[PDB]
Amino acid sequence: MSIYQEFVNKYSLSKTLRFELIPQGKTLENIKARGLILDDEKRAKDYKKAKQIIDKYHQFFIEEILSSVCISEDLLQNYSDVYFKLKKSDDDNLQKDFKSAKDTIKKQISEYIKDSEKFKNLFNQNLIDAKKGQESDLILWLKQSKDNGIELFKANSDITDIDEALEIIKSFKGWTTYFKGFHENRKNVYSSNDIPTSIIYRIVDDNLPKFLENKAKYESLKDKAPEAINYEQIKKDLAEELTFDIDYKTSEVNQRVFSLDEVFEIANFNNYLNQSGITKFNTIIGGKFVNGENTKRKGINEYINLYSQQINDKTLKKYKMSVLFKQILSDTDKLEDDSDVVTTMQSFYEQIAAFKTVEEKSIKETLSLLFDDLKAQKLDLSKIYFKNDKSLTDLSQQVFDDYSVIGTAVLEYITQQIAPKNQELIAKKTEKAKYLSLETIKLALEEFNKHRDIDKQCRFEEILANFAAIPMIFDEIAQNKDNLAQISIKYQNQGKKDLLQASAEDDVKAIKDLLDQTNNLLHKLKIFHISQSEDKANILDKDEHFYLVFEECYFELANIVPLYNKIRNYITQKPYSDEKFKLNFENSTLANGWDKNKEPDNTAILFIKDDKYYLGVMNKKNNKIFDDKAIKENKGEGYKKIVYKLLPGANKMLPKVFFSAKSIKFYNPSEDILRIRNHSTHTKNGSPQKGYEKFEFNIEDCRKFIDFYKQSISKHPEWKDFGFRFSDTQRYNSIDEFYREVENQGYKLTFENISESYIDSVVNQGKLYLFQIYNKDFSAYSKGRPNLHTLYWKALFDERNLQDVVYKLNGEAELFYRKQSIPKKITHPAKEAIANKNKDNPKKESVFEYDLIKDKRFTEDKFFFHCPITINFKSSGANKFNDEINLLLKEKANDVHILSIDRGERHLAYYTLVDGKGNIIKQDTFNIIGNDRMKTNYHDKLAAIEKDRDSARKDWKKINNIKEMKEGYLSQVVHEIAKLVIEYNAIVVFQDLNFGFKRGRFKVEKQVYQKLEKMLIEKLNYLVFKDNEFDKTGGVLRAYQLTAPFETFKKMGKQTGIIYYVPAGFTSKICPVTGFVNQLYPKYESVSKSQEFFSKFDKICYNLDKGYFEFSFDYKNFGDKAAKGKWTIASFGSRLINFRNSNWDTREVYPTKELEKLLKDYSIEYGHGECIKAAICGESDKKFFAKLTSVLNTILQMRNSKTGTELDYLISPVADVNGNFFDSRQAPKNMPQDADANGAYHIGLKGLMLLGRIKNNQEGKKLNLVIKNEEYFEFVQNRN
RNA sequence: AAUUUCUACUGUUGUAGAUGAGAAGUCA
DNA sequence: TGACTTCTCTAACGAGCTCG
DNA sequence: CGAGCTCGTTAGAGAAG
């Protein structure tokens, strides 16, 4: 029987059921008449015009907290010393010191911000509404905008001036419940974490590493060039700009021209860093544009362009000075129309190309001159770095025709340079190091050429020539701008979406190409650019001339990845607008509690006429319909208005009502009890109120202070309806678990009848707006299975729920409304034969008596109802969930038949039920989805869309209509994974995407396979089966909670519940029977160096009766230690070889017939029947050894597509213990069948040894769930 | 080619499966 | 480029307000 | 300014590895 009987109703989560309202009776006629929904646009669309007001005031607060901060020089001298140690000498134990050196400067400001006076009333209610004596801070500044005559609008923003903004900001009087995600996603702007958009993460990582860099290029400038910077001219010329009102070390209030000898001081760090101080610093260092003289009076960086120009020294051009970047939330829009689909692009290629710079070098010539200055080795090669991730692999792709030739040369040269006989430092100098210099690259490429002939060289000059193939890409952009200027005169229309239709295919493919040769252009400069990453915080001895001109042409060119995603998210949408908004019935309280006592203001209540469900929203002004005297007066039959009783919090309510100004006399205790609440002695560790202090808990308190609550609850007027069943008060350890005694039992839901004729008349009177929630299950024309957001709603109100409560209703439901997006167009009229679209369905015809408008749910207005509920409310929460599982299946480990999912070359997954020994019980593909009614082949449905016999092969409309259908496949297949893990009650084991993941070209990408393990963790955390009994396990309330929730992809680790994780390195290229891995990689390193490598083979011999040659090897005679054992690989069957398609598509080559040819071509004899050891090693030729490697580039290839997309079977070199060779044309059911069946059976074998560790668990709860290749390659081979 | 929304649908005024919503700095 | 925060998941009371 | 009147305060567990 299923072992997961225990894993039922375990923890709590809150899904939100959504519905459509039906305006019934005369509900909609009163709404349109009084102007209700038309005056709802002005406070559900218009707050986006108020989110332009709040952030601008949130920008004025930046200007008046950073010009009001004064940080010490003690934490700048503790920064700048470590800031210059790591440049000249980077190490490990100073990174812990550098982080703590910058931790208490990003926290010392983070405690100054949270202790100001404009901050506590800015992320809460009181930002926008005024107190009776305290007028709020938004309305003061907009009046202060008039108090000084400032003209903040009609020059920068959308609103005319502040006078209409004075009207707009008073449209949110009691409406403070809007901004609660707009005021939660701006607590990251003042967050002390490492998130990359703040003002305290930025002034420690974007200007403080740039200002202290720019001080070393000023102390090393006055001694090396005294005459250069004319001090006496910049005092007179820019005297108005240099009026810095405050100094640091003297705290002057002297509005005077500062001295340039002291503005570059480390102590003077606080004279800037608002929006108007970085402007002042970048006025001197970049020049001041004043067009009153028709010339530029350019500052100190013009003096470097005069002093080093005359005497002609390019070492003072190393000492140029940089530009500080502009602060986050400066003064600087998602796309929906087509009037601005072109001028968000044609007004960018005017900005990225047609602009005159400061020093007069156009951006075509900047990458032209600098890469030509790098061409003949002029710049220093030990200061320009490569990004050491697999983006440098792409730099080896375009010119070296190999992926890992650079990453091996910086592993081969560093091997001989430091530890030439391999032991500790050898990894992090070239592998874990985030950057490698060109001097390290050049001394690794003119060393590998010394051990290689003329045919296969690897020249450093080709990398310099590859970068010279960059600066003429800007010339064909200047040719495409002559092509893409005839389209901007064709789209002058405002909102019509004729660039999204399928007729202009010849005008969208002129845009994807132009946004692809400016998106690999940024992916070839990506290997240069410095990263401000974490755990290394990358700082090295950088170049002084390269990385100042490169930042001119990267961070101005980097504004295309937030612009390429503004088009590919515009073309790949659907032709209707899902722009909905919430409607409120002239009330800031729509569904907040649903409670019976608090519903003249919660405004809403539900109904049931014994089959379907309704919503009744009372009109807020005349809401006197159900004030407890018209229910008994109108009792009868019909609707079944609920009384809903809720008690949120046994921390927040039970001291609020039992120690109030009213009910304190009704439950009168002695002063023995009153000393507890004052000093907070009942709490183990909490918070007393003002007046007293915290004391120590004793066991006498919370076995009698709870008894105060038992007499207080049992005499309450409206809190006797719950019927509490509290346990024995001696068995109460704390009040945190007496919370859980009050909170779950403080919830009842029973029914009271109302005569149907009254509340059919009050909707006719116009006081009860009545609505019906429905789906395709709550209509009368259905018989099949419901949805899951309708099988939950029918369990909020069932009687078997309310016995032992599971589905709790929550407050703050939210009513939404959606306008008319697309017009009504009947695409399938009545009595017309329509075409089938399934290649297995017999009934090819389709004639409908009723019409079908194309997706008509976006043609007519829909009132919505988004209703959060709570699942398993009575039970506990989620603490140490995955540790409970491993401590449970230890006595149930011999019931667990491990399921295992992979990616796919030909398939999409190959889920495989591996047994404990390893014999596959039931494997099947994941291309055929469904029960015997209809069957759908998503493999064939991909293969007709996936860039196959389609229009133009490159447009964005394909590559998401693959992906959304591929994502819609992920919505399908998670049910067919869930059915297996209950029928075969085991586990899921995916492939992790942290480290150790598969690399090749698959259908399922890296992107759309982490979502299939994201959409499985949120459909195995709460798992309901639509065809199971209600009160039985696996049903609706007694359902499957087997995993934990989803926090991040990083926090999945090796285990997040029943879904384990294993690596995905070397699982698809292994013989399943014996465990061979091709670790003896042939690459044709040299002619003579291969000769001792063929003697590292034990014997290259032949057998008479066997009839096949063999390359016997053992791994003890060569490095990169992976496994052991005498192999004697064979040359039995045929191996296909892939080729460059386009003709030269596919041809078959036999290994043995090639070995018969290529060995009889020279004088080597074989036919005696013994070893050919010395004969193969004795031969010396260029062509011979460059061709025998192509035999070993074929005898070890274990994937072979038979023709174009037919089938790829599996072959095995290494023998069994009998003599037979594994061949998947005759493989049994307990062995893999296809090529993707071998990439899934080893993901289970590497997952089955997780379960070997877990069944042998001990008292040490430090379960080594990590996999090393020495552990896996030993387990898979000798398991029998 | 119909849906609380999404994907494929004819599975027939809808069938099989998924659905956590308002939110939204945006790393790159 | 697809994920990075962590909450509100609420009833009752003391409050100045037409009214008494 | 008590009639109670629609508001904007306000009461303040112990999990979180």
Residue whose C-alpha is closest to residue A941's, from A917, A908, A988, A893 = A908
Give dist(CA A1234, CA A920) in Å, integer: 14
Tokens for A971, please give them: 């919505």
Tokens for A264, please give them: 């570059």
Q: Please state the three-class secondary structure of A657-674 as a single string.
A: HHCCCCCCCCCCCCHHHH
DSSP-based three-state secondary structure for A1186: helix
Query: Is A1258 a domain residue?
Result: no
A176 CA from D10 C1′ (Å): 17
The 10 Å Cβ neighbour count of residue A518 is 21
Query: Is A339 a domain residue?
Result: no
Task: Considering only residues 169-188 of chain A, list those whose CB is below 7 Å from strand C.
Answer: 177, 180-181, 184-185, 187-188
Between the alpha carbon of residue A17 and those of residues A789, A937, A956, the distances in Å are 5, 31, 33
Residue A311 C-alpha from the chain's centroid? 54
Those residues whose C-beta lies under 8 Å from the C-beta of residue A162, and which sit 6 or more positions away, are: A142, A145, A146, A152, A153
Query: Is A1203 a domain residue?
Result: yes
Residues A683 and A773 in one domain: no
H or E segment and range at residue A869: strand A862-870
User: Residue A401 is which amino acid?
Assistant: D
The 10 Å Cβ neighbour count of residue A9 is 19
Tokens for A1246, please give them: 């590497």
Residue whose C-alpha is closest to residue A122's, from A57, A206, A219, A170 = A57
Name the protein residue, with chain letter, whose CA is nearest the C1' of B21.
A16
Q: What is the separation, in whole angstroms, between the first and last Cα of chain A?
A: 29
Query: Is A866 a domain residue?
Result: yes
Task: Considering only residues 223-262 of chain A, list those whose CB is below 7 Å from strand B.
Answer: none
Tokens for A15, please give them: 């899904």
Give dist(CA A221, CA A227) in Å, integer: 10
* Beta strand pairing call for A814-818 and A912-914: unpaired
Residues A914 and A1047 in one domain: yes
Task: Considering only residues 799-858 of chain A, list those whose CB is below 7 Å from strand C.
Answer: 808, 810-812
Give dist(CA A87, CA A102) in Å, integer: 16
Closest-approach nucleotide to residue A620, Cα vs C1': D6
Residues A960 and A891 in one domain: yes
The 10 Å Cβ neighbour count of residue A1234 is 21
Q: What is the total residue count of chain A?
A: 1280
Identify the domain boundary among A1235, A1251, A1271.
A1235
The 10 Å Cβ neighbour count of residue A144 is 12
Residues A527 and A549 in one domain: yes
Q: How was this structure determined?
A: cryo-EM
- Can you give the C-alpha Rg of chain A in angstroms? 37
Name the protein residue, with chain letter, whose CA is nearest the C1' of C6.
A184
Give dist(CA A357, CA A372) in Å, integer: 20
Residues A188 and A306 in one domain: no
For residue A174, list its beta bridge partners: none
Those residues whose C-beta lies under 8 Å from the C-beta of residue A77, and which sit 6 or more positions away, are: A266
A732 CA from D7 C1′ (Å): 39
Q: Is the CB of A594 under 7 A from strand C?
A: yes
Give dist(CA A612, CA A602) in Å, integer: 23
Task: Considering only residues 20-39 of chain A, list those whose CB is below 7 Å from strand B.
Answer: 20
DSSP-based three-state secondary structure for A1164: coil
Domains contained in chain A, number: 7
Which long-range contacts link A164-171 to residues 24+ away (Cβ below 8 Å)? A165/A53, A166/A142, A168/A46, A168/A49, A168/A50, A168/A53, A169/A50, A169/A53, A169/A128, A169/A138, A169/A139, A169/A142, A170/A139, A171/A42, A171/A43, A171/A46, A171/A50
Residues A427 and A554 in one domain: yes
Those residues whose C-beta lies under 8 Å from the C-beta of residue A590, and which sit 6 or more positions away, are: A584, A602, A603, A604, A617, A813, A814, A815
Residues A686 and A793 in one domain: no
Identify the domain boundary among A724, A745, A766.
A745
Burial A996-1023 (b: 16+ CB within 10 A, else e): bebeeebbbeeebbbebbebbbebbbbb
Query: Is A147 a domain residue?
Result: yes
Residue whose C-alpha is closest to residue A1049's, from A1018, A1072, A1075, A1005 = A1018
Contact A1201, A1146 (CB under 8 A): yes
DSSP for A435-457 reads EEEHHHHHHHHHHHGGGS-STT-
Give dist(CA A445, CA A467) in Å, integer: 17
A835 CA from D3 C1′ (Å): 74
DSSP for A282-314 reads HHHTT-EEETTTTEEE--GGGTHHHHHHHTT-T
Contact A881, A1041 (CB under 8 A): no
Phi, psi angle pair for A1254, to nearest 5°: -75, -35
Closest-approach nucleotide to residue A945, Cα vs C1': B8
Residue A14 C-alpha from the chain's centroid? 22
Domain residue limits at A57? 38-71+109-198
- Could you tell me where the beta strands, DSSP code E, fall in A703-845? 747-751, 768-774, 808-809, 814-818, 826-828
Contact A485, A396 (CB under 8 A): no
Closest-approach nucleotide to residue A790, Cα vs C1': B4
Tokens for A786, please give them: 């419901």
H or E segment and range at residue A1273: helix A1269-1275
Those residues whose C-beta lies under 8 Å from the C-beta of residue A954, and which sit 6 or more positions away, are: A509, A512, A513
Name the protein residue, with chain letter, whose CA is nearest the C1' of B3.
A776
Between the alpha carbon of residue A1239 and those of residues A390, A1068, A1072, the distances in Å are 23, 4, 10
Task: Considering only residues 532-571 of chain A, list those whose CB is below 7 Å from strand B.
Answer: 532-533, 561-562, 565
A137 CA from C3 C1′ (Å): 35
Q: Please state the three-class secondary structure of A1043-1090 as a single string.
A: CCCCCCCHHHCCECCCEEEECCCCCCCCCCCCCCCCCCCCCCCCCCHH
Dmax (CA) for chain A in angstroms is 114
Residue whose C-alpha is closest to residue A636's, from A750, A768, A799, A757 = A757
Tokens for A430, please give them: 């070239």
Give dist(CA A724, CA A743) in Å, integer: 10
Which long-range contacts link A135-140 to residues 24+ away (Cβ below 8 Å)? A137/A57, A138/A53, A138/A54, A138/A57, A138/A169, A139/A169, A139/A170
Whose structure tokens read 């090529």?
A: A1235
Q: Is the CB of A926 under 7 A from strand B?
A: no
Closest-approach nucleotide to residue A944, Cα vs C1': B8
Residue whose C-alpha is closest to residue A313's, from A221, A230, A250 = A221
Exposed / middle / buried, residue A914 (Cβ in 10 Å: 0-12, 13-18, 19+): buried
Tokens for A979, please give them: 């059915």
Q: Is the CB of A348 under 7 A from strand C?
A: no
Query: Is A1261 a domain residue?
Result: no
Query: Is A1082 a domain residue?
Result: no
DSSP-based three-state secondary structure for A244: strand
Residue whose C-alpha is closest to residue A477's, from A563, A350, A302 = A350
Contact A342, A487 (CB under 8 A): yes
Q: What is the dihedral of CA A45, A51, A53, A55, to 10 degrees?
A: -170
Identify the domain boundary among A870, A899, A915.
A870
User: Residue A814 is which amino acid?
Assistant: E
Tokens for A770, please give them: 């009545």
Contact A978, A1020 (CB under 8 A): yes
Chain breaks in chain A (C to N over 2.5 A) after: 332, 422, 1142
A1058 CA from B27 C1′ (Å): 31
User: Residue A661 is which amino acid?
Assistant: A
Angle at alpha carbon of residue A115, lines to A109 and A121, rounded to 5°: 120
Query: Is A348 a domain residue?
Result: no
Q: Is the CB of A878 under 7 A from strand B?
A: no
Give dist(CA A979, CA A984) in Å, integer: 8
DSSP for A684-720 reads SS----TTS------TTTTTTHHHHHHHHHTT-SSSS
Between the alpha carbon of residue A160 and those of residues A156, A166, A232, A334, the distances in Å are 10, 11, 45, 21
Contact A674, A659 (CB under 8 A): no
Closest-approach nucleotide to residue A735, Cα vs C1': D13
DSSP-based three-state secondary structure for A971: helix
Q: Write the DSSP symbol of residue A993.
A: S
The 10 Å Cβ neighbour count of residue A650 is 18
Residues A1030 and A915 in one domain: yes
Residues A831 and A930 in one domain: no
Residues A490 and A404 in one domain: yes
Q: What protein residues sit with their CB closer than 7 Å to strand D?
A: A 125-126, 129, 131, 173-174, 588, 601, 649, 651-653, 655-656, 659, 677, 680, 683-687, 689, 734-736, 739, 877, 879-880
A732 CA from D13 C1′ (Å): 13
Residue whose C-alpha is closest to residue A356's, from A440, A439, A289 = A289
Angle at alpha carbon of residue A265, lines to A263 and A266, rounded to 5°: 135
- Could you tell me where the beta strands, DSSP code E, fall in A432-589? 435-437, 580-582
Those residues whose C-beta lies under 8 Å from the C-beta of residue A284, and which sit 6 or more positions away, are: A234, A238, A241, A242, A260, A263, A299, A300
Q: Is the CB of A665 under 7 A from strand C?
A: no
Q: Which nucleotides of D are covered by protein (CB under 7 A)?
A: 6-17
Q: Is the CB of A157 under 7 A from strand B?
A: no
Residues A525 and A407 in one domain: yes
Between the alpha carbon of residue A651 and those of residues A647, A739, A743, A808, A1195, the distances in Å are 11, 7, 10, 20, 72
Q: Write the DSSP symbol of residue A1139.
A: -
Residues A241 and A262 in one domain: yes
Give dist(CA A692, CA A706) in Å, integer: 22
Exposed / middle / buried, residue A932 (Cβ in 10 Å: 0-12, 13-18, 19+): exposed
Percent helix, strand and coil across chain A, each to the nearest 5: 30, 10, 60
The 10 Å Cβ neighbour count of residue A1094 is 19
Task: Considering only residues 807-846 of chain A, list those whose CB is below 7 Å from strand B.
Answer: 814, 816, 827-828, 834-838, 841, 843, 846
Burial A436-473 (b: 16+ CB within 10 A, else e): bbbebbbbbbbbbeeebeeebebebeebbebbeeebee
Q: Write the DSSP symbol of residue A4.
A: G
Q: Is the CB of A859 under 7 A from strand B?
A: no
